């Protein structure tokens, strides 16, 4: 409710400073008791940073802030209640934004694991995720009205570059701690990092997102290959190794539910551009998510471990999907649902990219490839099938709709008619058709009543079952 600038002014600032600076001091202490407490401390610290009206990380410019005790009060005050006489001394232990951001970047490039920098992940980064946006609003790059922009200097210096750097460093940290068995901090890091993704620049895609999803996709491919081998060889041993692959699925899904929620926001803020000016990196990311979703639909263990992760870890997923409206504040099925699943949601969001890849004429080939995939043909099989049935491409001369659709295809700057080639068309149709077919299966599985739980017969024979 944006009440901080009116509530925390004179002594509430002192109390909030003291709380903030003690909580930051915790970083030095290493103990068993601290470990369990750092999550809640970091959450409280984040909410304090979002609300607290001063910029304690940028004190040198506090002179320009009016919601500060040092400006509001006379120097003859602040002496009756012992104060350092300088904003910097209020608690110097907390570093400035520059130093803190530099330390985060250094750890990320070094490859530090969670154990080396646990204070950061659990306490510091959430605080920045709440600090940087609030002060980006009040600093330069903010929407300037004439007089407000020209009159008082901005206390803060936050720009979109700070947020982009922080997001990149966070992604680097996650990839460095990607394979580890125990990464309970990821779920919280994602929820804290979500807000700052809006300022994310386009270059972040190529710099960070593509390699992450590529590594994760490759791991999923290896695990499903092991699953196929374990099914190929079916013994009492098959019970063994299945535990292993389920563990791999659990850790993998943890990494996915950490990374995707940020990507969804990045897509929602760059889909318009990716569709107006086509982006090859966006298409590659679509291919990645499509492969992952295909593995998800094909594998029984992958899906069930995803569900288990979600239910045990109390992941909302509806928060991640609907946060924009929420942020702006203007039953097992309810807890987890396939449609709520991030794996399906990200793919649905990026599907427009893959359909933009496909020209309108290719729709007939897409339908045929869907039929073949329902016949359970392989990727190379559908490729050669469409290669031999390529002549069958749709013709605009027959229908008027294709005329204006193809006119728009021209209107796209990146598109050139001479660029289209048979191999491109067959590959493109293969990818989009596979994704759409598996998505149809997911949408209308008919999986219901597979294990009836109406238990009507048991309500009838209730005395007999006992």
């Amino acid at each position: 409710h944006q009440f901080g600038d009116d509530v925390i002014l004179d002594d509430v600032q002192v109390s909030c400073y003291r709380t903030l600076c003690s909580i930051y001091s915790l970083g030095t202490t290493k103990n068993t008791y601290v470990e369990k407490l750092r999550p809640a401390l970091g959450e409280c610290l984040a909410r304090l940073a979002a609300a607290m009206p001063v910029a304690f990380l940028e004190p040198q410019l506090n002179e320009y802030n009016a919601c500060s005790v040092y400006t509001t009060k006379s120097p003859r005050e602040r002496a009756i209640l012992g104060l350092p006489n300088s904003v910097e001394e209020m608690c110097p232990d907390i570093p400035v934004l520059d130093r803190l951001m530099a330390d985060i970047g250094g750890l990320a490039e070094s490859g530090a694991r969670y154990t080396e920098m646990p204070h950061v992940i659990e306490i510091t980064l959430p605080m920045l995720c709440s600090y940087l946006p609030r002060w980006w609003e009040r600093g330069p790059e903010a929407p300037p009205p004439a007089l407000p922009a020209g009159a008082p200097p901005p206390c803060t210096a936050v720009t979109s570059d700070h947020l982009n750097s922080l997001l990149g460093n966070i992604l680097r940290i996650i990839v460095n701690n990607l394979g580890i068995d125990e990464a309970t901090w990821m779920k919280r890091l994602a929820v804290f990092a979500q807000p700052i993704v809006s300022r994310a620049r386009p270059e972040l895609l190529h710099s960070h997102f593509i390699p992450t999803i590529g590594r994760l996709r490759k791991r999923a491919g290896k695990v499903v290959a092991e699953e196929e081998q374990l099914r190929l060889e079916a013994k009492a041993e098959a019970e063994e190794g299945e535990l292993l692959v389920r563990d791999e699925f659990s850790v993998l899904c943890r990494d996915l539910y950490a990374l995707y929620p940020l990507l969804i926001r990045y897509v929602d803020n760059n889909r318009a551009h990716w569709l107006t000016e086509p982006n090859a990196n966006a298409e590659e990311l679509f291919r990645m998510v499509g492969e992952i979703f295909i593995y998800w639909s094909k594998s029984h263990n992958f899906k069930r471990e995803e569900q288990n992760f979600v239910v045990q870890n109390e992941i909302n997923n509806m928060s991640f999907l609907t946060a924009d409206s929420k942020s702006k504040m203007a039953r097992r099925g309810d807890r987890y649902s396939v449609q709520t699943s991030l794996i399906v949601a990200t793919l649905k969001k990026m599907l427009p990219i893959g359909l933009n890849m496909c020209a309108p004429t290719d729709q007939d080939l897409i339908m045929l490839a869907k039929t073949r995939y329902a016949l359970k043909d392989t990727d190379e099989e559908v490729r050669e099938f469409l290669q031999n049935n390529l002549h069958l491409q749709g013709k605009v001369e027959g229908s008027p709709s294709l005329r204006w659709q193809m006119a728009l295809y021209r209107g796209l700057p990146g598109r050139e008619e001479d660029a289209d080639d048979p191999e491109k068309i067959v590959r493109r149709v293969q990818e989009v058709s596979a994704v759409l077919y598996h998505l149809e299966q997911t949408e209308h599985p008919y999986k219901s009543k597979k294990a009836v739980w109406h238990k009507l017969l048991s309500k009838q024979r209730r005395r007999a079952v006992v």
Partner: protein
């Protein structure tokens, strides 16, 4: 009988933004003058003659909509009882042209100047052609609203408004006491030429749909300060009165200094001097004589408004810190009045609201007082004429004056607080404006039913130029214009003023738009879903729902629809040109949705809700009202009886009901130059006809009006009274006086049952039934009434060829209200003989099926023309005035209903 067709030109009306009126206590001058100069006129650009008319019109009722209307269309000045016009040879009112004599009679031609004068006291409207008098005047017309100059024209015209001063230069001197209309432009507005009640304009990307306009009233100019006469003031307030007075004097002096006035023996604005400023005691008494009451009124209003006033610190009330102006600043006198220090005083935000409120009241009191003295408003200041550019109630005032008044008042309040008289503001209270009528508030635009879709995936866009009340979505073909969009089951819409989705009620959905935001409405009839996007982002409920609506039943189908509230502007793109769609590619294309008009050669035809009330047959299934056709007996005549279906029940509808009969009686073209058995010769040669209305016992006659209506009655007034009937008098005389003719014109001719109820307020409810009889002689134009066989004094005289419908206006107080009795008196024919040619000579009363009860319905669907007249408005210059031009012709095929005389 058969419908008639002819080709007619489109006619448009243009007015300046000058609005004049008369009301008790109004700050507004009665007499006004303007001129119109003709530059170029094409008599016959088409087969139909060019249309040009000049005159005055009334805001509340002059709604000439393009194309169809009364008579054969071409509605303009004088085609309604709200407008008064002059074409060169005739005076137009009520769609009737009355010849008027002028020297060199001729239809308006180039190099002709029409001088229009309006005197609101009489009231009267007069004309002069090229400096020569027009031997005819409108008078005795209604004053229920504001008057504005207007010219109605077809294509083939160039004209220039001359309003005086800069905004035109008069060619003939205004007559004495008649002000130029340029003096009426309000402080907050600038002079301009505008259409009247437009539902459509052009813009950069395309046509903009326009909602109803918010218009002023003659009462708005009346200042209405809160009453403070009956109160009592505490002794501390009485004593502080004079000190506060002299203090505001010295503050006035200080401000006047900072502007730059020095000591002067004379007060004038050019003189650059301020006498009062010598000492805060030396101020002349007359200034005190004015401002002591002003000071007292401050405190009296503080009491009236409910603010709690006490003493906080008598020590500060006695002793005060005094801020002295800098000795650096110099005065002729050498003494500068030193006011109280403002720094030691702080005011809460509630104090600021109190300041706004007391400024309202102070300005209104001053205004109202000057009005009693005889002052009036005028954009140009003339003190000898008692005209002021500020003599308007505070709300209409300009922000600059307004701000000066807040600052003065807030300094005065801080001065009182320095005196230490504590003031506690009361809690704020809500209020409702009720500016427009509910029917006139909202306009609905929809696609034509031909475009109804029962299958597919369709997309269309709606840009919101305003951020106010507008709703966009999908509607069923039988959508009622009357109901608000989404309240019923016939519409699924989104309202971005609040972030709501409407279908059978409101539910939160999505987020409000900003200016320029585009709402993409998508409908999937394969998945049976409705989707809304805002600038490429799918709006979601307070959940994960991507669909506003689900499980829709296709039924008849769906149509694009939008609703604009007052002061609203939208742009509806149905996708005829796909390139014009800004967010279709971002959302809708890959999803497969197609534009609603992807492969349509011509733009989709639209219909809009027209708030002009028209008479429609009473629905057989109407929940509240039932009409019974009662067969005639030997003792009783044929009858049409009205009953209240839902009387004495919650959900019942009790409101004014305007009813007429479907068929008229028409008066002769040429009027003649001057037991209980009907005599055959008399009854066969008579021209007198009769009907009656029986008001049943339990129905209050005071709530009943009986008589006739002309086919131009469109007045749907809940607060109905015979004073609301439109009336006008056309008077023609010789060059000097010598009135040859005086004709009264009115759309409504009726009698009040309160005039016939014997004085019986005690036991007002009467077991008896009241039978009001109405008689008309179709050869003399004479209309008379009977109460219970007793002749009433009320009589009417109407011109030949007039059409009149039997009419009853009633407010039900009973389940059995009224009975149209279509019978006869001795030697008088019934209405059937007059209505039907075959029965002209048959006295036997009878009610054929065509005769039926029709009820006034405020709103109706009307087709929006595909093309609109292109009108150029400009300011040619200071002397030339404001120029209006229409050069390109437009024609419409008109279908004319003869009995109703509309097209």
């Amino acid at each position: 009988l058969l419908l008639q067709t002819n080709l007619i030109n489109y006619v448009t009306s243009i007015r300046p933004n000058i609005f004049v009126g008369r009301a008790e206590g109004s700050t507004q001058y009665g007499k006004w003058y303007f001129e119109v100069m003709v530059d170029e006129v094409v008599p016959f650009l088409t087969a139909q003659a060019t249309h040009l008319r000049v005159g005055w019109a009334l805001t509340e009722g002059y709604s000439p909509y393009p194309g169809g209307g009364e008579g054969w269309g071409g509605n303009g000045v004088g085609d309604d009882l709200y407008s008064y016009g002059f074409d060169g040879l005739h005076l137009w009112t009520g769609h009737v042209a009355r010849p008027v004599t002028s020297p060199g009679q001729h239809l308006l031609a180039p190099e002709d100047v029409v001088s229009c004068c309006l005197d609101l006291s009489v009231p009267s409207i007069s004309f002069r052609i090229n400096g020569c008098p027009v031997q005819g005047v409108f008078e005795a017309f209604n004053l229920d609203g504001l008057f504005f100059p207007v010219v109605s024209f077809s294509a083939g015209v160039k004209v220039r408004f001359l309003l005086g001063g800069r905004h035109g230069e008069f060619k003939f001197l205004p007559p004495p006491g008649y002000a130029p209309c340029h003096e009426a432009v309000l402080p907050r507005e600038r002079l301009r030429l505008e259409p009247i009640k437009e539902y459509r304009r052009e813009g950069p990307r395309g046509p903009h749909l326009v909602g109803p306009s918010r218009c002023l009233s003659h009462t708005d100019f009346v200042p209405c300060p809160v009453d403070t006469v009956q109160i009592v003031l505490p002794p501390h307030l009485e004593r502080i009165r004079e000190k506060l007075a002299e203090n505001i004097h010295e503050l006035w002096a200080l401000t006047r200094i900072e502007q730059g006035w020095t000591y002067g023996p004379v007060r004038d604005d050019n003189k650059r001097l301020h006498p009062c400023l010598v000492n805060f005691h030396s101020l002349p008494e007359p200034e005190r004589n004015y401002n002591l009451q002003m000071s007292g009124e401050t405190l009296k209003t503080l009491l009236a408004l409910g603010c709690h006033v006490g003493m906080a610190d008598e020590k500060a009330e006695d002793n005060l810190k005094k801020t002295k102006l800098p000795k650096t600043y110099m005065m002729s006198n050498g003494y500068k009045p030193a006011p109280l220090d403002l720094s030691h005083v702080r005011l809460t935000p509630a104090q600021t609201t109190l300041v706004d409120r007391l400024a309202e009241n102070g300005h209104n009191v001053w205004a109202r007082d000057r009005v009693a003295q005889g002052w009036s408003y005028s954009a140009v200041q003339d003190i000898p004429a008692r005209r002021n550019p500020r003599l308007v109630p505070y709300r209409l005032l300009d922000e600059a004056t307004k701000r000066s008044n807040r600052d003065s008042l807030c300094q005065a309040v801080r001065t009182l607080l320095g005196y230490g008289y504590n003031i506690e503001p009361p809690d704020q209270e809500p209020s409702q404006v009720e500016n427009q009528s509910r029917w006139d508030r909202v306009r609905i635009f929809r696609a034509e039913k031909s475009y109804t879709v029962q299958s597919g995936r369709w997309y269309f866009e709606f840009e919101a130029v305003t951020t106010g009340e507008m709703r966009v979505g999908w509607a069923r073909p039988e959508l009622r214009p009357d109901v608000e969009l989404g309240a019923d089951e016939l519409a699924y819409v989104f309202n971005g003023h609040r972030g709501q989705r409407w279908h059978l009620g409101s539910e939160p959905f999505g987020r409000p738009w900003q200016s320029g935001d585009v709402v993409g409405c998508m409908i999937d009839l394969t998945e049976n879903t409705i989707i809304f996007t805002l600038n490429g982002e799918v709006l979601m409920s307070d959940s994960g729902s991507e669909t506003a609506f689900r499980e829709i039943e296709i039924g008849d189908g769906f149509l694009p629809v939008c609703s604009l509230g007052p002061g609203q502007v939208g742009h509806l793109n149905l996708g005829q040109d796909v390139s014009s769609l800004r967010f279709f590619a971002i959302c809708g294309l890959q999803e497969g949705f197609e534009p609603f008009a992807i492969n349509m050669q011509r733009p989709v035809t639209t219909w809009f809700s027209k708030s002009l009330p028209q008479f429609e047959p009473v629905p057989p299934e109407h929940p509240h009202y039932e009409v019974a056709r009662m067969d005639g007996t030997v003792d009783t005549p044929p009858c049409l009886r009205l009953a209240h279906r839902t009387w004495g029940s919650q959900n019942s509808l009790v409101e004014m009901l305007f009813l007429r009969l479907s068929l008229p009686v028409q008066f002769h073209q040429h009027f003649r130059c001057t037991d209980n058995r009907d005599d055959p010769e008399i009854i066969l040669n008579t021209t007198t006809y009769y009907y009656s209305v029986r008001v049943f016992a339990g129905q209050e006659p005071s709530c009943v009006w009986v008589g006739w209506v002309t086919p131009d009655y469109h007045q749907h007034d809940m607060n109905f009274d015979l004073s609301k009937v439109r009336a006008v008098t056309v008077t023609m005389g010789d060059e000097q006086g010598n009135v040859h003719s005086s004709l009264k014109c009115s759309n409504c001719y009726m009698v009040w049952g309160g005039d016939f109820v014997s004085p019986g307020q005690q036991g007002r409810i009467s077991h008896t039934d009241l039978v009001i009889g109405c008689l008309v002689d179709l050869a003399t134009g004479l209309m008379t009434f009977t109460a219970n066989g007793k002749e009433s004094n009320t009589f009417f005289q109407v011109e030949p060829n007039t059409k009149l419908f039997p009419a009853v206006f009633v407010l039900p107080t009973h389940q059995n209200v009224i009975q149209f009795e279509l019978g006869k008196q001795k030697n008088i024919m019934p209405l059937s003989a007059a209505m039907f040619l075959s029965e002209r000579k048959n006295p036997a009363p009878q009610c054929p099926p065509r005769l039926e009860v029709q009820m006034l319905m405020p709103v109706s669907w009307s087709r929006m023309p595909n093309h609109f007249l292109q009108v150029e408005t400009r300011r040619a210059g200071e002397r030339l005035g404001w120029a209006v031009q229409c050069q390109d012709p437009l024609t419409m095929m008109a279908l004319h209903i003869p009995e109703e005389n509309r097209c």
